[PDB]
Amino acid sequence: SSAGFDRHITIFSPEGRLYQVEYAFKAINQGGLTSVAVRGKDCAVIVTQKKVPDKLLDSSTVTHLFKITENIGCVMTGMTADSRSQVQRARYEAANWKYKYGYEIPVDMLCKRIADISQVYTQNAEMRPLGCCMILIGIDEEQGPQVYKCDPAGYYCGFKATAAGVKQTESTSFLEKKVKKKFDWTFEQTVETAITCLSTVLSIDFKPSEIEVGVVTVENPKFRILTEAEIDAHLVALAE
Amino acid sequence: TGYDLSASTFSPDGRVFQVEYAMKAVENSSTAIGIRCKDGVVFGVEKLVLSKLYEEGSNKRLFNVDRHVGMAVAGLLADARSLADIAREEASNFRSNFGYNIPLKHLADRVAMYVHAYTLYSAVRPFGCSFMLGSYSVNDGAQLYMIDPSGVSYGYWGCAIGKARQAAKTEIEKLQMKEMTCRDIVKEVAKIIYIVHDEVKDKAFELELSWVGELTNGRHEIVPKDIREEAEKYAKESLK
Amino acid sequence: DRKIEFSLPDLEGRTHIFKIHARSMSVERDIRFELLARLCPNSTGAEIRSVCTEAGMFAIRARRKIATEKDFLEAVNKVIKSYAKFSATPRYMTYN
Amino acid sequence: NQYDNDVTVWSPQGRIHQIEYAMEAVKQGSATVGLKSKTHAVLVALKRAQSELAAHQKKILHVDNHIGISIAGLTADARLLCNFMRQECLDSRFVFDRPLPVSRLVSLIGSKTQIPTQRYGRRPYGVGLLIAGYDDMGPHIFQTCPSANYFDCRAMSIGARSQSARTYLERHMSEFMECNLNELVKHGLRALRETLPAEQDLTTKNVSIGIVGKDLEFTIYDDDDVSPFLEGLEERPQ
Amino acid sequence: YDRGVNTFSPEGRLFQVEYAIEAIKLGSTAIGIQTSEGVCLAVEKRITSPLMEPSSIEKIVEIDAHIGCAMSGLIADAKTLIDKARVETQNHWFTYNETMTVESVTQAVSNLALQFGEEDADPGAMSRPFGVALLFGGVDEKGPQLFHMDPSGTFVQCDARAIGSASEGAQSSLQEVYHKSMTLKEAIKSSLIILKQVMEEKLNATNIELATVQPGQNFHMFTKEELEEVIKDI
Amino acid sequence: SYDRAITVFSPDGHLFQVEYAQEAVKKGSTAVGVRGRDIVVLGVEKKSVAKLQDERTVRKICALDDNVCMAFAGLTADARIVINRARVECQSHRLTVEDPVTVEYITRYIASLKQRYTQSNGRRPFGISALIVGFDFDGTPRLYQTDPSGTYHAWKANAIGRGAKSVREFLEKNYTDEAIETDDLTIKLVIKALLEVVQSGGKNIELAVMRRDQSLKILNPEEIEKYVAEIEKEKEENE
Amino acid sequence: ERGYSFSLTTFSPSGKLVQIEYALAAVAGGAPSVGIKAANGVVLATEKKQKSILYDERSVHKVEPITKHIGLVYSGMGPDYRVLVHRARKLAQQYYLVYQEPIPTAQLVQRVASVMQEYTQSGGVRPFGVSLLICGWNEGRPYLFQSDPSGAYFAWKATAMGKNYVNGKTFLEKRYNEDLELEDAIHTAILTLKESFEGQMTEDNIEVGICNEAGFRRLTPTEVKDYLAAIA
Amino acid sequence: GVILYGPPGTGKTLLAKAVANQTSATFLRVVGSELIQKYLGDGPKLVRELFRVAEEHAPSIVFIDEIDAIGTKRYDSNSGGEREIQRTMLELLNQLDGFDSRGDVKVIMATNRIETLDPALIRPGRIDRKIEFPLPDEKTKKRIFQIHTSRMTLADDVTLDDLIMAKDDLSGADIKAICTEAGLMALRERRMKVTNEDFKKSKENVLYK
Amino acid sequence: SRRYDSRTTIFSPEGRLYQVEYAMEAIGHAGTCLGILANDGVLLAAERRNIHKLLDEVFFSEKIYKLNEDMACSVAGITSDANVLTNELRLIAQRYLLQYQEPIPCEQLVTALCDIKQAYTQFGGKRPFGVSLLYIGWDKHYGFQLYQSDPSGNYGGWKATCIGNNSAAAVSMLKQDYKEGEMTLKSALALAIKVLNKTMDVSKLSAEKVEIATLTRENGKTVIRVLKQKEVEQLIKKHEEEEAKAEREK
Ligand SMILES: Nc1ncnc2c1ncn2[C@@H]1O[C@H](COP(=O)(O)OP(=O)(O)OP(=O)(O)O)[C@@H](O)[C@H]1O
Ligand SMILES: [Mg+2]
């Protein structure tokens, strides 16, 4: 199935495939964490888990959520250093767009620019294609909430319910089963579904100190991170 | 085989092998610990004497990055000195550009990005030094950060690097460092380094201690000689 | 326990091998082998044995019963410098 | 063994091999010794020649009136580094108008030699510099290596068969703290004579000497004026 | 099975340089002797066919009015070194207005021997070190001086040198016929005797060439008129 | 900006790229050349006419300048660039020192270029061997031969290409003073040497002669027939 | 930094370029597509399929307008398509700046093919993995063209690409002619796309583009549903 | 030892046949394509048995043809991979120059791709003579045409000179092919003589496909 | 980095260099082209390959390209490199005209293109051009001319030549039947028709499967014509009837 240096760099194998890129997809799973994103009628929610195995480590600096812009938020999975570098590039690109065009940048253009930047690594034979994923949420005028996803191969898309990480398949299956019912979506319902998805996929029944939640809505488009108290409030309201 | 010769080849299971080899190069360094107090941090390094010819004070492993920032290194000395130089130049550049002393959350990030830039391409090799940055400011308290050669930096309440890192952190966790001022911490640091590295492994060694915090009004410097004398005099009592 | 190494003969080895391999033939009384040793810098004992046999064959070729120095010169100029596209020593001195 | 053909490749044990081979290369040169007293720094070198009809190779180089060096390895890289040292010291003398302290110079050499050990298709420098100097803090002895890792020492000896000299220097360390040049040089020569077979020792044609002091400029002695120093040595015990 | 141009050996050696060192055992032999009277240089030619023009090939070529050079090994690439030495001596004369010493020329030309490289440079010299061995003779302020250079870049002063394919035998014979109170005539006679003893073809007045330099006159090259006089009385 | 070593030293001390180039030369067409007191004659063989060629576009003898000519053996792709560079350099020498270029100067220039071209980065060595003939100023006819490693020489009579050893063996036993007494006798000597080589039956020879007076004089396939006939008749009469 | 500066595409002992063949093999596994022209305009039809209901089918598009009267569709790799689209847009812009006229179709095809060819000879790179279809309407006569990873191009009356392209070409052989209208062309395009389509064809799994002498545009899902009905 | 190399179809096996006819010793022939077996360790066994048979008879001649066929083509029927080829090679090298007393056996080898086989197999002391067979020259072309139509009832109209340069670089086998094909074509029409047009069509039939 | 290199410039032990050889083996397949001249006018004949039932047939030319007012050229091999080379020599001709204000002679243009083509076989480390092509033209220096190129770099003048897959048979038949200085632009067409009939396996010579281009001279025009499909058919049938008559004679 292989002949020559197709296993070591990015050139076509005889069947028409290339493996140096689909190796990154399984390099994603090295972190062992999962994140979920849900879009509602007028809001968008990002939820993830966090694990602190030792008491000596300072728990205030292990967040995977990042504020790309006052209106656009993101979550990362995979190797940490690559995710940090991609965050840096995204910040610079958004600021440059604001400088050049005089108005705020749409989320889809930002995702496209990032994917186009990432596509070069799988074209030349001297670089390594950065095994880290990408999820962005934002609010757009005349469109409402928007949730987009980007991958190391350069394939970006726009979803309604997404999961990234170890448990991607069954979480997507559960989300599909829930969304086929076609019920009305409000803020509390979206947050409850997002939390219960992870809760039933992992079967933990966790505490208000082991997850992180970010939310955006059309009342204050600023990206905000929920404080532990109100997270506990949703958690207890979920359990009747 | 051959998947572990370049730094641009993912192995079939999806991970990079050269960086792991750099890690294994680090694990043979001696030891270095650092813990933060109520109003500062304290570093501690045990330095082995290879032969009697060398002079005291040779090849210090406790570097002074900036006027209020200190560094402790472990690994290969040459790469450590290069990293110290690049961090020093970066800090001076920041002070010239903006106009005040750089915070840790920015300097540590910049050095981490520069280190991570050397793990993608096949024309350069990954670094081989793991190091710690410490500081104290009146408006921000005490700050401690640790950076590894793979390009990852975290914040800690107390950390150890070298051969017996886990053995040291075992007695590190027993301490209630959250409360006391770091005037009595020197004695316990001396005690915790004299309880490792059995005399069977090596004959003699020496202690190097740093100091920064509000006690010094922001300056970073070596401890006075008499204080270290008293500290080691106290630490010798573990023979009981 | 021991790792004896066999390397290509330097200069005395070449003259000594010539003397051993040519001491049982009908040759002229005043030939000097040191020059022949100087003419083949890096070579093995096998090529020297081949040199001797080929010089003898050149003498037999025409009619004579005793070889001369010209025969040895032609043998060296044919088995060392013309059969050089077919040697193993350039790639086995790196042991590959 | 494919982990042996470049300076970029990391071994499974985390040991690059090209640096180790350069450290192997530096051991092929002739032995040399260096040491310091309270107010002087003295280094001694043993020369070598191929045939009896050829002059002995020169080992001690003059860097500046307060800095001298001794080499071991291959001569081309040694000359390149010596030229760089000359240039840096002259530039410092020109700008700030003051001698360059030894420590800063050694740090500059260390930062310079580290660069080739990281790029692609670049080799390290094979040299064994021993640096002797005098400064505001007094005498100074330094040793470098091809791995861009300098050491600060009070007495050292490197080259081929340097171990016995190191043993002698180590067991006679304290006596260096009080004596003056007259017997300090004799101690250095006694150490150097230890690394030779039992046939030939010192005949004034194979030994060079270099001194720097508080009020004495860097001075080199070779083959004619060494006789005053060489006389007064007891015979090698049998 | 491929290694870079600069690569160290398990024992401390460089690969390209060792090969170049052993590749000069294919060239002609050449002998140089130094005496307080002057410096003598002699070399063979190794004519292959009767249709040669023996005057076309030459080994001894003068660098300046008082410095001569003899080359052995390959000959194609020694021209660059010779031209560099010429230009450098002329530049020193132009700037300082004097004649530069032999040792300075040798150490100035030896700096260029080991600059071959494959990465991070302009074309320069791609790989091969030079593959020539050079003998320098001259008369400077401290008398007559002879120097010998090596493809590794190491130069050293000698008193009697022989380089080429017949190096070791000529050196062994030369060690026992030399003293420090020679004259030029006996030096020339000894060099001729050695060359006759080791050379393959019969010696005559067209197979060899010789040069001598003295403090009095400048670099002088013998011709086919006075060359047979020193031969007939051998 | 392709920079990588092509020519390197073999462990026993040889540069295999240069030897491969020489062996590539050793399978070209044969070329021969001799000089007299006033006429210098050089010829080529193995024309192998396919009665469909335009002979003016395949000539292997080119005129560098008024008093110099050159014939090459090897692969023809690399010849014309060396031709062009030599023409430009020899014309450039005219704007400086006013005297015309001697044959020695241009031969040294070509040899130096060839040698330098085996030292740079990412360049394979040239693959041709050349004979340069000329009657320089003051009337001293001479010829030189250049090699792919960059070593030129001065000879009296040369043969390069396929089957050169036999031609050289024939020439070194036949080149005599009286054999060069007459112009037609020298041309007959060249024709005899070529005919004693690869078959080349009278219709596969192209010769050119300089008389140290004017430009090249390429001779049509008519005088060649007369010379061949006279040589054959003399050979028959001798037998 | 620096690249490699040596070609990764070389000649085999049998006189063939291997990498181009492997790129064509990768192209053959893409989504199917069809293209027809009949005397009045051109029709481009392509099939799209989201993996699950979670994907938003109105977020991205397959058919993309280079300018007011040029259309382009692809078959093969996904990410490589956008680079070519962007380059084509740039090239049209320089042409219009210089000549102050809309670019003719043939010139654009030639320039794009030149770029794609140049991308297989330079150093340290690998060729693109897509096959393109380009359509336009200039000076009355409609034009249709097809590119190739090797850089060559052809002019066609009817073309099928992607999976089972041989069956599509044979089917078009027995159906197409030289005198129809855009509506019948649409009908036969949907008919031939139904050969390898899914079980049920909805108004959102298919993208259709039409060019006439009024300009290029992409059909909205409503009329696509109208065309899907009353047929098959 | 003696080895013969050159381009294909130039007369190596023919010289071997002539030696076999003239000689008086027992003659053993084996092709290289059958030195590779389908199990493990069978190849060395076969080599050992071959030289044992050649040794135990008498003064003899061993002829091995197309050796390079073991290094060029690979077969899936081989149980091992490429290493058992190496084991067979090591066995052959031992048999040529082992430390046992060889006796009285002569070895002749022949191939047309000599730039691939192992240089340790051809060193002096194992193979001492190397003979190159070049392409035929036009004098030899005329001589070959004279040989191969010696007993053919050839008509007077034909001329060999025209056929000599029919192809620029034709080898020895093309001559025999052309002659035999012309003979067959004349045989079809129940004739005895051979005309020009027969040769003219025969060359097109044999050369231009 | 030196592990992944292919070394597309070095020599070989046997003297030759492989890449140009492999390119020449590649030019063996894929097409057939030939050229002939003996008097006023020179003709090129090409075998069309793309003969599928669905081709729009635009651009008025398949393989014949115009390079100047009086220069035309065919091509065989990979078509993309053909586009590159044709575009490359077009501006060479134009820049010569710009500098000298005189139509460029054919020989100089061919030599310039061959120099560019040879540049890739000595340094750079890139894959060579796998294209060989013909040239036909007229100039005041030597009247009418035909030339042939080569991926190796060399060239040469000719009187009648073929390049395609069956070039051997075409060359043999050409050298068997030709006359020097008599063939007008009436017999050359018949000769080319017969040669193509022999080389291609398909009989009856479908008129859509061949392409003919002729160059003739006028007072000041030097007209290049691509004769249409309305004149090939009677030429073919005339060849057929005369061949049948000649065979019936025997
Ligand atoms: N020099 C020659 N003299 C006579 N006949 C010859 C000669 N060369 C070739 N032939 C003819 O060609 C035939 C081919 O011979 P043979 O197969 O032995 O050649 P080969 O070159 O050794 O073959 P291979 O390389 O394919 O093993 C011979 O049988 C003979 O008919
Ligand atoms: Mg055979």
Swiss-Prot record, chain A:
UniProt keywords (A-Z) are: Acetylation, Cytoplasm, Glycoprotein, Nucleus, Phosphoprotein, Proteasome
- Listed PROSITE patterns: PROTEASOME_ALPHA_1, PROTEASOME_ALPHA_2
UniProt cross-references to CDD domains, sorted A to Z: proteasome_alpha_type_6
Q: What is its main location?
A: cytoplasm
At what positions is Phosphotyrosine found? Answer: Y155
List where in the cell it is found. Answer: Cytoplasm; Nucleus
Query: Could you tell me what this protein is called?
Result: Proteasome subunit alpha type-6
Q: Which organism is it from?
A: Homo sapiens
From Swiss-Prot, chain D:
Question: Keyword set for this entry?
Answer: Acetylation, Cytoplasm, Glycoprotein, Immunity, Isopeptide bond, Nucleus, Phosphoprotein, Proteasome, Ubl conjugation
Q: Carbohydrate attachment sites?
A: S107
- Entries under SMART domains matching the protein: Proteasome_A_N
Q: Which SUPFAM superfamilies match?
A: N-terminal nucleophile aminohydrolases (Ntn hydrolases)
The record places the cross-link (Glycyl lysine isopeptide (Lys-Gly) (interchain with G-Cter in ubiquitin)) at K112, K205
| Keyword Zinc-finger in record | no
The record's Gene3D superfamilies line, in alphabetical order, gives: Glutamine Phosphoribosylpyrophosphate, subunit 1, domain 1
Q: List the disulfide bonds.
A: none
Per its record, how is this protein called by name?
Answer: Proteasome subunit alpha type-1
Q: Which organism is it from?
A: Homo sapiens (Human)
From Swiss-Prot, chain G:
Q: Which residues carry this modification: Phosphoserine?
A: S5, S12, S14
Q: Which GO terms describe its cellular component?
A: cytoplasm; cytosol; extracellular exosome; extracellular region; ficolin-1-rich granule lumen; nucleoplasm; nucleus; P-body
Gene name tied to this protein? PSMA2
**Keyword Acetylation among record annotations:** yes
Q: How is it modified after translation?
A: Phosphorylated on tyrosine residues; which may be important for nuclear import.
Q: What is this protein called?
A: Proteasome subunit alpha type-2
> Does this UniProt record's set of keywords contain Cytoplasm?
yes
| List of residues that carry N6-acetyllysine | K68, K169
Give the domain of life: Eukaryota
Family classification? Belongs to the peptidase T1A family.
Quaternary data: The 26S proteasome consists of a 20S proteasome core and two 19S regulatory subunits. The 20S proteasome core is a barrel-shaped complex made of 28 subunits that are arranged in four stacked rings. The two outer rings are each formed by seven alpha subunits, and the two inner rings are formed by seven beta subunits. The proteolytic activity is exerted by three beta-subunits PSMB5, PSMB6 and PSMB7.
Enumerate the CDD domains for this protein: proteasome_alpha_type_2
Q: Which residues carry this modification: Phosphotyrosine?
A: Y4, Y22, Y74, Y119
Query: Which keywords has UniProt assigned to this entry?
Result: Acetylation, Cytoplasm, Nucleus, Phosphoprotein, Proteasome
> What does the record give as the function of this protein?
Component of the 20S core proteasome complex involved in the proteolytic degradation of most intracellular proteins. This complex plays numerous essential roles within the cell by associating with different regulatory particles. Associated with two 19S regulatory particles, forms the 26S proteasome and thus participates in the ATP-dependent degradation of ubiquitinated proteins.
Where in or outside the cell? Cytoplasm; Nucleus
Native organism is Homo sapiens
From Swiss-Prot, chain I:
The protein's UniProt keywords, in alphabetical order, are: Acetylation, Cytoplasm, Host-virus interaction, Nucleus, Phosphoprotein, Proteasome
Its induction, per UniProt?
Answer: Down-regulated by antioxidants BO-653 and probucol.
Q: What broad taxonomic lineage does this protein's source fall under?
A: Eukaryota, Metazoa, Chordata, Craniata, Vertebrata
A Gene Ontology BP annotation from the UniProt entry: proteasome-mediated ubiquitin-dependent protein catabolic process
Task: Record the organism.
Answer: Homo sapiens (Human)
The PTM N6-acetyllysine maps to: K126, K175
Q: Which residues carry this modification: Phosphoserine?
A: S12, S74, S172
Its family?
Answer: Belongs to the peptidase T1A family.
| InterPro entries (alphabetical) | Ntn_hydrolases_N (IPR029055), Proteasome_alpha (IPR050115), Proteasome_alpha-type (IPR023332), Proteasome_asu_N (IPR000426), Proteasome_bsu_CS (IPR016050), Proteasome_sua/b (IPR001353)
The name on file for this protein is Proteasome subunit alpha type-4
| Quaternary state and interactors | The 26S proteasome consists of a 20S proteasome core and two 19S regulatory subunits. The 20S proteasome core is a barrel-shaped complex made of 28 subunits that are arranged in four stacked rings. The two outer rings are each formed by seven alpha subunits, and the two inner rings are formed by seven beta subunits. The proteolytic activity is exerted by three beta-subunits PSMB5, PSMB6 and PSMB7.
Q: Which pairs of Cys residues are joined through disulfide bonds in the record?
A: none
Any one GO CC term of the record: proteasome core complex
Which cell locations does it reside in? Cytoplasm; Nucleus
Show the PANTHER family listed in the entry.
Answer: PROTEASOME SUBUNIT ALPHA/BETA
Superkingdom assignment: Eukaryota
